[PDB]
Amino acid sequence: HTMEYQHLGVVPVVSAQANSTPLGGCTLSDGVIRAMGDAARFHVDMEQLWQAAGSFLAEATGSEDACPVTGAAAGMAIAVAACVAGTDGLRVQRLPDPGDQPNEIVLQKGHSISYGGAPLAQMIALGGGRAVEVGAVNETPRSHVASAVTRRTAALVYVTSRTHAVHRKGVPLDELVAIGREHGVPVIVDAAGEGGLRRWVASGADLVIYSGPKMLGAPTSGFICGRGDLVAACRAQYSGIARPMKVGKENLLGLLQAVREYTAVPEEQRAAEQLERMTKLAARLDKIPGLSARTAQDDSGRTIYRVLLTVDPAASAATLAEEMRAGIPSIYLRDFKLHLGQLEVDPRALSPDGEESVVRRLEEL
Amino acid sequence: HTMEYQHLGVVPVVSAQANSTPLGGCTLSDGVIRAMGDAARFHVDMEQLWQAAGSFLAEATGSEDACPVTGAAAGMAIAVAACVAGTDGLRVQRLPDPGDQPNEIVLQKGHSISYGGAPLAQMIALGGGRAVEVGAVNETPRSHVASAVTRRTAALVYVTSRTHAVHRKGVPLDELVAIGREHGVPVIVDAAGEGGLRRWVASGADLVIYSGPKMLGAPTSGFICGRGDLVAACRAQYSGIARPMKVGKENLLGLLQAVREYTAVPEEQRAAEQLERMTKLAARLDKIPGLSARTAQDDSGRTIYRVLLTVDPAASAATLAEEMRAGIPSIYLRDFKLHLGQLEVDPRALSPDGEESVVRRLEEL
């Protein structure tokens, strides 16, 4: 019959570390799945579909236009290419050679992140740019950034993630927009796993990048929204460095159905339901022998709740984390606080049956 | 009479953000002050004093030898120069020109910190080296570091601070030592504000840098301890790039008296006294109108305690922080958690009269 994971010997896993790309991103709702199936039955003008999908994604973000991509990593490469090559078909097809165009891409040292091993500076190089890192991980003064903007500067890159990037004594986004407007250089925003669909565009940034499977519950996909002229320069890159970064019509329709369902549920019900589900889950874990648990808000200051595990060695935090990933139902928890002897259970990719699969696997030790 | 701060119009300040360099570092005990005064009355062979002070500082750290410096920033420059120029008097006096010596200094992207605005890579350039940053702030695989070590590599730099540097999915120190021993390249450790005087040397690193005023309660000073041959190459740099980084005999004797007093008080009494003093201080603050307080261990996982303030806007966290630094007794608190609407009160530079100066200044608002 139809091939499934069990046919390939791939047993599913339990994701208690949110929508990780190495874990397939996220699971789709029945509506997202059905949208991918209906789009796979007809031939459509992809230029007309891209223009229509862009206006849909721009309205949901309050921006001028939008351009779908495969994800946040491809979003950065295309956004940089749009600022370097523009819409000239010959310059587009000559990238990553910048030719005679300014291609310096300025960013703070603390924002030099990696996309699953691929550095953000490598995505800048694919788009014909050269990364110029300013400041240090613990400090980057505003004057350091403004002095780094010259006639050879093509764009400014800002990473919003307080999990993968560091912002301590850095330059805020509104300061970068003020710097960009002062010299006339675009500002590119990496908002890969951000839930706010309008706050980052409202900052005045020219291009804002979202990843699909992170929060919107979409298949492998993404989009770049912002100013109309630069979003138009993004689309032109699909005749160049963005040609290998294909976006199938099934992924795009599945992405639009994910946004329509995301903008329907209010953020209050999604936060309250998670806050009450993790409060009930933290009680079941705190009663385990030699394990303390409590509901804790996101340390970065977001409306996301999890269960901070206190793996006291009287009952090893590092050894116990590997024990969960090797059981019969493979379970992946957040281990960023393993140096503090702690672990976390993220509910953003955890099914109700997945919650029971974690309490049972924990009770067996 | 004798000139003091009041004669210059400099009014003292209250340090609730530990021993910050911009705040004069730290205050000295009566014994440290007396040691600086007694050393200022006699002429001594500085080579004999440096040899004697090195053996004293090496015994307290369990290393082979030690070399005093002005502080952690100068420690990095001299340690790099020791790995690049060695002990050749001509190469020492030709730095920061490396000549024909290998001068690549490999470090993780997350460890590219700054010393009060001066980047760590700039300190590497002063010592005749070239910084090679590997990986990203959120990830740096071990293979990335080992592949970056070539015949042109002079040393490996590791920053221990979990406050100013990022270690998330990075390379641990014992892995760097294994990499250094594999290729035969020294390992340089920035342990500026570390309290452990022996754990970092015991890791096998060749050179370990400590800053005086940070934890040891010393005047402006510092030292580099580690392997004998490289510590000898550090001393030779004082005929070169370390000549402007003078260390007066008063600062050095004051540093040794600080180490003798530090190794006398057990870490149990210093941690218990702080844990009980901040527990009593957190109760006086939690009773303030619209302010919650509690004793919290160091988020990085250290035996240091502070009072996490919950500045609810019902009674602005950012505005209230500036209000404390502008009062009649200027008070500086930790504002690294201001994005979370919080603030901290560090007791490492807070006198008992300084504690009362903070509760009174907080009660006046």
UniProtKB/Swiss-Prot annotation, chains A, B:
Catalytic activity, reaction form: (5'S,6'R)-C-glycyluridine + O2 = uridine-5'-carboxamide + CO2 + H2O
Binding site for phosphate: 163, 302, 306, 334, 348
Pfam families recorded: SelA
pH-activity relationship: Optimum pH is 7.5.
Modified residues (N6-(pyridoxal phosphate)lysine): 214
Keywords from the UniProt entry: Antibiotic biosynthesis, Monooxygenase, Oxidoreductase, Pyridoxal phosphate
Cofactor(s) listed: pyridoxal 5'-phosphate
Effect on the protein of changing residue 287 to A: No change in activity
Effect on the protein upon substituting residue 214 to A: 20-fold decrease in specific activity
Enzyme Commission designation: 1.-.-.-
Activity regulation as described: Activity is dependent on phosphate.
MF annotations from Gene Ontology: L-seryl-tRNA(Sec) selenium transferase activity; monooxygenase activity
Biological pathway: Antibiotic biosynthesis
Biological process according to GO: antibiotic biosynthetic process
Cofactor binding, note field: Requires pyridoxal phosphate as an oxygenase cofactor.
PANTHER family, A to Z: L-SERYL-TRNA(SEC) SELENIUM TRANSFERASE
Family of the protein in this entry: Belongs to the SelA family.
Subunit structure: Homooctamer; tetramer of homodimers.
Job description of the protein: Monooxygenase-decarboxylase involved in the biosynthesis of the capuramycin-type nucleoside antibiotic A-503083. Catalyzes the oxidative decarboxylation of 5'-C-glycyluridine (GlyU) to uridine-5'-carboxamide (CarU). Is stereospecific for the (5'S,6'R)-diastereomer of GlyU. Directly incorporates a single oxygen atom from O(2) into the product CarU.
Record's protein name: 5'-C-glycyluridine monooxygenase-decarboxylase
Organism of origin: Streptomyces sp
